[PDB]
Enzyme design. Structure first.
Site, mmCIF file in Angstrom:
data_model
loop_
_atom_site.group_PDB
_atom_site.id
_atom_site.type_symbol
_atom_site.label_atom_id
_atom_site.label_comp_id
_atom_site.label_asym_id
_atom_site.label_seq_id
_atom_site.Cartn_x
_atom_site.Cartn_y
_atom_site.Cartn_z
ATOM 1 N N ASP A 68 0.799 -6.054 -8.498
ATOM 2 C CA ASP A 68 2.140 -5.914 -7.995
ATOM 3 C C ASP A 68 2.674 -7.262 -7.461
ATOM 4 O O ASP A 68 3.138 -7.463 -6.317
ATOM 5 C CB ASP A 68 2.197 -4.766 -6.801
ATOM 6 C CG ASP A 68 1.470 -3.637 -7.278
ATOM 7 O OD1 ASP A 68 1.356 -3.028 -8.200
ATOM 8 O OD2 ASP A 68 0.272 -3.378 -6.396
ATOM 9 N N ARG B 245 -6.384 -6.654 -12.518
ATOM 10 C CA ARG B 245 -4.953 -6.738 -13.102
ATOM 11 C C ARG B 245 -4.526 -8.077 -12.521
ATOM 12 O O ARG B 245 -4.683 -8.538 -11.318
ATOM 13 C CB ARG B 245 -4.258 -5.814 -12.093
ATOM 14 C CG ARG B 245 -4.301 -4.394 -12.830
ATOM 15 C CD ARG B 245 -3.756 -3.442 -12.011
ATOM 16 N NE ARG B 245 -4.204 -3.204 -10.825
ATOM 17 C CZ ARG B 245 -3.896 -2.359 -9.482
ATOM 18 N NH1 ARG B 245 -2.710 -1.844 -9.734
ATOM 19 N NH2 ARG B 245 -4.501 -2.496 -8.467
ATOM 20 N N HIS C 233 4.710 -3.170 -12.751
ATOM 21 C CA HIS C 233 5.142 -3.467 -11.582
ATOM 22 C C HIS C 233 5.732 -4.834 -11.633
ATOM 23 O O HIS C 233 5.210 -5.926 -10.953
ATOM 24 C CB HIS C 233 4.041 -3.059 -10.450
ATOM 25 C CG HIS C 233 4.969 -3.246 -8.981
ATOM 26 N ND1 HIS C 233 4.344 -2.338 -7.980
ATOM 27 C CD2 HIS C 233 6.101 -3.676 -8.632
ATOM 28 C CE1 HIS C 233 5.154 -2.583 -6.911
ATOM 29 N NE2 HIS C 233 6.279 -3.261 -7.622
ATOM 30 N N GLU D 214 7.502 4.119 -11.307
ATOM 31 C CA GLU D 214 7.249 3.513 -9.906
ATOM 32 C C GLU D 214 7.520 2.009 -10.266
ATOM 33 O O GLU D 214 8.140 1.583 -10.963
ATOM 34 C CB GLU D 214 5.784 3.638 -9.528
ATOM 35 C CG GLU D 214 4.826 2.969 -10.777
ATOM 36 C CD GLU D 214 3.401 3.132 -10.388
ATOM 37 O OE1 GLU D 214 2.942 4.109 -9.405
ATOM 38 O OE2 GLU D 214 2.638 3.050 -11.349
ATOM 39 N N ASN E 4 3.961 12.204 -10.562
ATOM 40 C CA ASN E 4 3.460 11.506 -9.351
ATOM 41 C C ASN E 4 4.732 10.786 -8.488
ATOM 42 O O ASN E 4 4.595 10.752 -7.406
ATOM 43 C CB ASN E 4 2.385 10.256 -9.570
ATOM 44 C CG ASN E 4 1.682 9.880 -8.664
ATOM 45 O OD1 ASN E 4 0.745 10.895 -8.019
ATOM 46 N ND2 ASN E 4 1.640 8.695 -7.979
#
Ligand SMILES: [Mg+2]
Ligand SMILES: [Mg+2]
Lengths: 325, 325
Positions: free
Chosen positions: B16, B299, B265, B201, B164
């Site tokens: 993120d 990530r 993200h 998201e 979600n």
């Protein structure tokens, strides 16, 4: 090479940094990760490349409450011994302190069946605990070859000696088993070795000019952390403590004017010129730490050249400043 | 600048990734740390500098079991609004799943009383939860200014819509309070948004060529993770969902031949030339995760330039390869 050729801190949020320059043209890097939950390796063709090298996990801690190796995975070192990879690391079965207020770590070893140590977790098998006659707190093991034999050097608590840990040496029967009874080389005793905690830990070995130089770290892992050094003739009995000489003062310590606090748990490597010796260590850049310093993740890995004095002893100088833009 | 000027992955083990270039020329960086236990910030004068930038902790999670903000601190974004620093982040009161197998995050806000956002944790004050009419799973909030107003964009679960989370927009009364009832802008529905997990998201907003472009991430976080995009005219009623256009195809996806799996993200910044637009996102180099995937830390943050098509729409291209040595 010069210190300014490296962008420091080289590796953010990695303590107990261990670098090994292999015959395949790669630097391999192992260290304690901030969550202390696994063993990962990075590799790159250059030391600066390690800052951006994508890691691989090759071993994960055992599940919570499952016994040995389930908590606080500390200071792995990757060694290449008789054509095979081994990792020496410490782990505990719990985060709870014992009745002396100490961590409950023991020493472990994993072995790789592949020439590539970073291919997969399935290539690594557990040898279990490296046992010592007394079953007490032990960690930070390293190995070195000398006189055609394999020596194991580590930090361990003795109930009869004040403090948390002393440095020991023993010859190995094989890479996961001691052949001889441990011999104590140094214990915490000077003021610079006994700040907050009475500790001798993080041993590392350098071989040059007819001697072995064993650096180690002392005091707590906050700003007080500092490096000591033992010296021995390369042909002496390495298992006789009277063969070793202890430095009365630290050989490496905080450089407070440039905000480099508590350098330690070092290793040694060689620069890309194949000739310049490099000191690898962690260090903090602030002292307003909240809680236990072991759970603040900002010990950063530093690399810098070191030189040799006319008498053939190493000259580590002082920590260099950060130089990232 | 060119993509090869950046050493990728720029920031290892940060998900993120959020980069904000401040008016003083510092690049500020916030992201989810692998232990999900705190909010830290890095700053550097160059994007490559962030790879070696010593972080500072500016906020730590509340104690285990103490309620709000005590677990899984995710996706902080640092914004500068009317001369003050705000961080929008998500957190939970627990690691346990709800009765539907979902995470229990809610949205939070902290504000800084100082021009330097990295001075001390004592400088940050909690505004608490950013409440929505339905109290359900919510995270990944971002803000943007438009038409002399402040808009809040985020991801939230609607019990009546499969998946979600969906993306919502609302006008703000102040930087920690919604003024209007949330308006849904997108829900997971296309084949590329519903691979393995149905999700929308990680919203991010870009303003150019008379439009706002709202990117978001969809599908599972393996090689299927991909970015979508909504477009709206800069002078439209931003709270009318019919003003917004949804791309029927993804705008950024995995680059499978080079093993860049699941880019998402994202955030946006500008290069050191003050001109080149830069896409910031996380991506994996493997999907064979062992153990709990929540705690696989690999990530990595990538940065790369992007360009513009003839019609004034952005062209993100595809993930660039790693180029560290
Ligand atoms: Mg060591
Ligand atoms: Mg975001």
């Amino acid at each position: 090479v010069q210190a300014q050729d490296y962008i420091n801190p080289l590796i953010v949020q990695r303590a107990d940094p261990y670098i090994y320059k292999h015959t395949d043209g790669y630097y391999y890097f192992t260290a304690s990760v901030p969550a202390y939950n696994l063993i990962e390796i990075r590799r790159a063709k250059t030391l600066n490349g390690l800052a951006n090298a994508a890691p691989r996990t090759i071993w994960r801690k055992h599940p919570d409450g499952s016994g040995a190796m389930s908590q606080l995975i500390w200071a792995p070192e990757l060694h290449y011994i008789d054509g095979k990879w081994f990792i020496y690391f410490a782990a505990s079965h719990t985060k709870e302190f014992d009745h002396n207020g100490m961590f409950q770590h023991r020493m472990y070893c994993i072995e790789c069946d592949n020439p590539d140590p970073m291919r997969d977790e399935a290539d690594w098998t557990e040898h279990g605990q490296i046992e010592t006659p007394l079953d007490t707190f032990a960690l930070d093991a390293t190995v070195f070859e000398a006189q055609k034999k394999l020596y194991y050097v580590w930090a361990q608590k003795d109930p009869a000696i004040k403090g948390n840990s002393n440095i020991y040496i023993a010859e190995m029967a094989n890479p996961w088993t001691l052949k001889t009874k441990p011999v104590m080389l140094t214990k915490p005793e000077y003021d610079w070795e006994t700040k907050i905690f009475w500790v001798n830990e993080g041993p590392a070995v350098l071989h040059r000019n007819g001697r072995f130089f064993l650096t180690y770290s002392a005091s707590a892992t906050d700003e007080n952390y500092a490096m000591g050094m033992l010296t021995v003739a390369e042909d002496a009995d390495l298992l006789d403590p009277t063969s070793w000489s202890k430095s009365e003062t630290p050989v490496f310590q905080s450089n407070m004017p440039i905000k480099q606090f508590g350098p330690g748990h070092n290793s040694f490597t060689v620069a890309e010129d194949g000739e310049t010796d490099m000191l690898v260590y962690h260090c903090r850049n602030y002292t307003d730490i909240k809680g236990d310093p072991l759970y603040d993740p900002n010990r950063h890995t530093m690399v810098q050249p070191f030189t040799w004095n006319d008498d053939g002893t190493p000259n580590f100088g002082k920590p260099v400043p950060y130089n990232y833009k």
